[PDB]
Amino acid sequence: QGALPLFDFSQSTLPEEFSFSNVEANLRFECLEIKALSKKHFYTSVFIEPQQNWDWSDLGNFCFAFDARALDEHSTQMFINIFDHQGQMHSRCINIAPGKQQSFMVELKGGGACNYASGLRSNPCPWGTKDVYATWMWGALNIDLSAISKIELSIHGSLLDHHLLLSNFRLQSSPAVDPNYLSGIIDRFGQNAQQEHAQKIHSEQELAEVTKAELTELAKGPMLGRSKFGGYLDGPRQQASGYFRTEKIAGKWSLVDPEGYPYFATGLDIIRLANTSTITGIDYDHKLVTAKVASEVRRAMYQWLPDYNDPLAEHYGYMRELFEGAVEQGETYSFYAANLQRKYGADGADYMAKWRDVTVDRMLNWGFTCLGNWTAPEFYDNQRIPFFANGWIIGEFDQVSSGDDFWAALPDPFDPRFRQRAAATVSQVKNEIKDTPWCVGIFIDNEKSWGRMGSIDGHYGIAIHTLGRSADACPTKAVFVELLKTKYTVIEALNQSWQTNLASWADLAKGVKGLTHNSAQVEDYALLLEAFASEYFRVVKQELKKQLPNHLYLGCRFADWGMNPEVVRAAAKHVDVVSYNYYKEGLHPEPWSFLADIDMPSIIGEFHFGALDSGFFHAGLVTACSQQERGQMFERYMQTVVDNPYFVGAHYFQYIDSPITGRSFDGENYNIGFVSISDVPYQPMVDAAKRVNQSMYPKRFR
Numbered sequence: 001q002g003a004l005p006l007f008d009f010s011q012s013t014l015p016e017e018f019s020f021s022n023v024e025a026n027l028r029f030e031c032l033e034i035k036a037l038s039k040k041h042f043y044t045s046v047f048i049e050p051q052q053n054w055d056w057s058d059l060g061n062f063c064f065a066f067d068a069r070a071l072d073e074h075s076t077q078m079f080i081n082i083f084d085h086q087g088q089m090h091s092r093c094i095n096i097a098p099g100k101q102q103s104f105m106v107e108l109k110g111g112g113a114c115n116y117a118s119g120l121r122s123n124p125c126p127w128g129t130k131d132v133y134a135t136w137m138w139g140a141l142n143i144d145l146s147a148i149s150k151i152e153l154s155i156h157g158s159l160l161d162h163h164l165l166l167s168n169f170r171l172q173s174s175p176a177v178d179p180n181y182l183s184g185i186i187d188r189f190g191q192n193a194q195q196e197h198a199q200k201i202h203s204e205q206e207l208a209e210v211t212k213a214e215l216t217e218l219a220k221g222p223m224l225g226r227s228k229f230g231g232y233l234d235g236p237r238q239q240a241s242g243y244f245r246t247e248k249i250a251g252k253w254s255l256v257d258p259e260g261y262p263y264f265a266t267g268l269d270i271i272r273l274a275n276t277s278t279i280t281g282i283d284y285d286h287k288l289v290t291a292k293v294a295s296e297v298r299r300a301m302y303q304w305l306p307d308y309n310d311p312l313a314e315h316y317g318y319m320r321e322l323f324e325g326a327v328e329q330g331e332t333y334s335f336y337a338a339n340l341q342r343k344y345g346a347d348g349a350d351y352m353a354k355w356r357d358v359t360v361d362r363m364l365n366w367g368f369t370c371l372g373n374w375t376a377p378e379f380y381d382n383q384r385i386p387f388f389a390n391g392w393i394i395g396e397f398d399q400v401s402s403g404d405d406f407w408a409a410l411p412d413p414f415d416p417r418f419r420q421r422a423a424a425t426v427s428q429v430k431n432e433i434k435d436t437p438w439c440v441g442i443f444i445d446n447e448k449s450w451g452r453m454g455s456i457d458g459h460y461g462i463a464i465h466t467l468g469r470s471a472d473a474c475p476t477k478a479v480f481v482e483l484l485k486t487k488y489t490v491i492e493a494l495n496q497s498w499q500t501n502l503a504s505w506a507d508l509a510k511g512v513k514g515l516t517h518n519s520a521q522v523e524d525y526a527l528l529l530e531a532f533a534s535e536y537f538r539v540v541k542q543e544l545k546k547q548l549p550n551h552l553y554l555g556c557r558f559a560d561w562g563m564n565p566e567v568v569r570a571a572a573k574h575v576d577v578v579s580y581n582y583y584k585e586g587l588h589p590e591p592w593s594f595l596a597d598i599d600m601p602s603i604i605g606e607f608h609f610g611a612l613d614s615g616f617f618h619a620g621l622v623t624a625c626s627q628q629e630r631g632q633m634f635e636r637y638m639q640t641v642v643d644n645p646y647f648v649g650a651h652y653f654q655y656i657d658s659p660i661t662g663r664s665f666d667g668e669n670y671n672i673g674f675v676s677i678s679d680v681p682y683q684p685m686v687d688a689a690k691r692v693n694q695s696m697y698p699k700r701f702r
């Protein structure tokens with residue numbers, strides 16, 4: 001086969017299939033010229049809809065493809081969302097670099113379709129190819145190809161406009177990939193063997209040279225201008241409480257350090273080794289109560305793994321997880337740990353202790369004012385740089401959900417057991433931080449499924465599902481009944497409003513399903529969701545303050561798909577700082593409108609930028625065309641937070657590159673580190689960090 005054109009751009013006008021939103025379009029010389037107005041508008045889209053659904057299930061293995069040029073100085077991250085008649089969505093993205101024309105391919109059949117987002121069940125797309133194979137991001141990998149109803153080219157969450165040239169839309173046959181395509185792709189350092197890039201390590205000798213060089217550079221000391229606790233030495237002095245605290249300063253929210261210096265929190269997440277391990281293939285399995293070929297394909301990717309008598313075999317580990325009557329396990333290895341020993345462990349030297357010292361040396365030299373979330377407790381007595389503490393509340397207690405699933409269930413805070421587990425969590429954080437003023441604050445939990453805005457069932461899923469449950473073993477449902485009874489008093493009044501025929505409050509309490517979700521019911525879902533969340537935040541706040549009354553409670557780190565006005569207002573009642581994770585190009589004005597009404601000091605828990613020029617298969621959630629642009633985008637993001645008067649900090653996820661073969665736990669495989677897997681700092685990230693960190697305090701504080 002080969003290629004089959006979908007359209008004809010020879011004509012004076014665009015084909016009827018094309019429409020636009022917040023995109024200016026002109027068809028000219030067989031190129032579709034688009035200006036996405038994404039600086040102003042959060043969502044911009046090109047829509048391609050056939051009048052009658054496409055049937056592409058008879059084509060064999062193929063890609064939807066097109067060519068693109070970006071005429072800006074910066075790249076464009078573009079999502080290609082392909083929808084079928086059923087509604088499910090195949091979503092991939094591409095980075096469109098400035099310069100020569102690129103060809104882009106979105107593989108819809110190959111299984112199924114090729115991708116690097118499935119861990120050991122990935123089927124590699126061609127890499128190092130001239131066609132760019134789009135990265136699978138969201139939705140379903142395999143959709144109903146017999147009834148394809150829409151394609152969306154989306155540019156969103158950007159700080160800039162983008163000017164693209166699109167041409168040569170086509171269906172293109174996809175050749176089968178060699179099963180041993182990636183054999184020997186990883187070298188002994190964990191790096192990509194078949195790729196070269198500016199800071200790649202080629203030998204232990206070069207490793208020692210580069211290390212010696214950095215250590216000499218770090219001998220130049222910390223970035224200047226900071227007080228002891230990393231606040232702004234020459235900033236408007238505030239009262240000192242002896243602990244990090246919040247304050248409104250010249251009409252902006254601010255943190256204040258223990259000695260009263262104004263404080264703004266910059267730093268990195270995951271300062272620990274636990275997330276650096278990757279599956280070796282040895283003993284890899286996934287079964288109930290082939291994995292074997294997946295096992296052998298993975299092991300053959302490694303050019304080197306240590307003999308079990310090799311001192312570097314110390315960094316082997318083992319994973320064994322149970323989930324859904326299925327056990328998944330395997331040997332793991334951390335090349336990062338191995339490289340630490342290579343770098344620092346000559347003559348039985350304590351390489352972990354050196355790594356800790358250099359890490360803190362690095363943060364202070366780069367200008368960061370803290371160590372971020374998931375910092376190893378070994379760092380907590382360092383007394384040179386502030387840190388953020390974290391705990392998880394787990395164990396046995398009643399739960400609520402959005403579905404019978406309980407896949408991502410939340411705790412029922414009206415179960416007495418939840419409070420006891422919160423106490424346990426707090427006791428361990430207290431034992432870790434030993435009341436030190438160097439602890440800026442404590443995050444509890446992370447990215448719960450509070451409800452995804454954009455649809456009733458998603459947004460108020462917790463309200464809707466819980467109403468379906470019986471109050472006898474669901475404390476939150478009992479609370480919901482008393483809430484509705486207080487609002488409506490008699491069941492007849494609820495029936496009038498809900499258009500239901502319930503016999504009594506007891507009838508409600510037993511469970512109601514198949515609700516039509518009218519406007520009155522949705523007002524009630526909102527009340528219910530907020531009451532539920534308010535008690536979670538109340539109980540956690542209380543248990544924290546009983547043992548650690550002086551330390552900031554920083555919330556639960558809202559993901560953008562796990563937040564809504566209801567749970568934000570609930571958090572605002574009880575947290576000291578509201579925490580958000582936000583993987584976009586920066587704090588785009590449109591979705592951050594609500595900040596004023598809440599008027600709480602806020603903190604970014606996570607963001608990042610990745611690329612593919614350091615030999616990775618996945619550039620992550622927000623992407624750049626090069627290492628240099630990663631640093632540029634880091635800076636652009638940060639300016640945006642420093643400029644926002646409700647934010648008091650931003651933490652970058654994460655310190656260390658993901659393994660190229662993926663994190664053992666979940667397969668996370670992004671080029672997102674400040675340092676490579678060989679512990680080499682990416683220079684434009686370091687440089688951007690320094691520009692941000694040296695400018696932020698004078699910019700912030702007038």
